[PDB]
Chains A and B, each alone.
Chain A
Amino acid sequence: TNLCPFGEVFNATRFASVYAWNRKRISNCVADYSVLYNSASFSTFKCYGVSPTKLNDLCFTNVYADSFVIRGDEVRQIAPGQTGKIADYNYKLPDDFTGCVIAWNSNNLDSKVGGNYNYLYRLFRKSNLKPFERDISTEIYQAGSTPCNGVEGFNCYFPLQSYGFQPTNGVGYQPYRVVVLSFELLHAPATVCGP
């Protein structure tokens, strides 16, 4: 009968970066989804495999909330079948994804006038990520035809780059907070239900 802690997810003070996105398991609660879609704060509310209006009528199990911060034009890369830096090396959604991608502008929280640098994205990986795979591993990688045996070769590229968030940046470069809700459709005795 108790409420699901969406306020600890959407209204959190700090979000982790997209390379180290935060995953929260939501279970044994009643989820009131009607305060999400009718809120005018979210610019992007795109649900795959479920309509957002019917979210109150279905009982799920093992609901996952994935929270991170990406810039403005990369919100389209949080979708099944997309390519880019975020989809390949930072956060990959499966082709059979069911759930909802919610994203809203957070320039007045996540931008500082000198430049906010608390948010990182991985620039390169040897292979694309598997879906729902987290790469917090920061490893020095090479450049080509010379090994990284110290300084001596071509100098060694770093995988994680920080976003340059200033509030004077135009929209599209501005911080957008992304929460991805992921469900499973009625395979076990369900724990997460609507009213």
Chain B
Amino acid sequence: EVQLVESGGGVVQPGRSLRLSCAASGFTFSSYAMHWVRQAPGKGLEWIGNIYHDGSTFYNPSLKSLVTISRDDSTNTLYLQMNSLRAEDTAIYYCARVWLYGSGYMDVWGKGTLVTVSS
């Protein structure tokens, strides 16, 4: 069946990098476009980035150069590199999947990963 699983969360020092992975199982990773979403405790959802089969990466204009979305298609996975961590990036992160041939419905979602940043 369709499934998105994530990994890479934890408690890390600020300014250290992170690499969050979103492995997809059960569906072919092409012809769908992948999103990264985060939400802070006490805050609503905030969209991070999009990446397509081309390699076109679109980021949120609100946060710039903190993240880098990296798709890989040999093993149907999605990577996010997070650099120079600030204290406000304590968040639950989600991997999302849209069909390119319909409305922008995000269908199934990742269960999410917890990222806690402190000193």
Answer yes or no: B98 CB below 8 A from chain A CBs.
yes
The residues of A with any CB-CB pair to B shorter than 8 Å are 112, 114-118, 120, 123-124, 136-140, 148, 150-151, 155-162, 164
Stretch at the interface among B13-21, B52-60, B74-82, B83-91: B52-60
- Contact assessment for A162 and B103 in the assembled complex, using a CB-CB cutoff below 8 Å: no
A115, A158, A160: which contacts B54 (Cβ < 8 A)? A115
Q: Is the CB of B45 within 8 A of A157?
A: no
- Tell me the bound Cα distance from A158 to B99 in angstroms: 11
Sample of 8 A–B contacts (CB below 8 Å): A115-B53, A117-B53, A120-B58, A138-B47, A138-B60, A140-B44, A155-B105, A164-B100
Bitwise, B94-117 to A at CB < 8 A (1) or not (0) is 101010110111111100000000
Q: Identify the B interface with A (CB < 8 A).
A: 33, 35, 37, 39, 44-47, 50, 52-54, 56, 58, 60-61, 94, 96, 98, 100-101, 103-109
Contacts of B35 in A (CB 8 A): 158
Residues of chain B lying within 8 A (CB to CB) of residue A112: 54
Q: List chain B residues, Cβ under 8 A from A155.
A: 105-109
Known A138-B47, A148-B45; judge A161-B104 contact (CB<8 A): yes
A150 and B43 alpha carbons, distance in the complex (Å) = 11
Note all chain A residues with C-beta closer than 8 A to B45.
Answer: 140, 148, 150, 156
User: What is the CB-to-nearest-CB distance from A149 to chain B, in angstroms, rounded to a whole number?
Assistant: 8
| A136 CB contacts on chain B under 8 angstroms | 61
**B46 to A: closest C-beta gap in Å:** 8
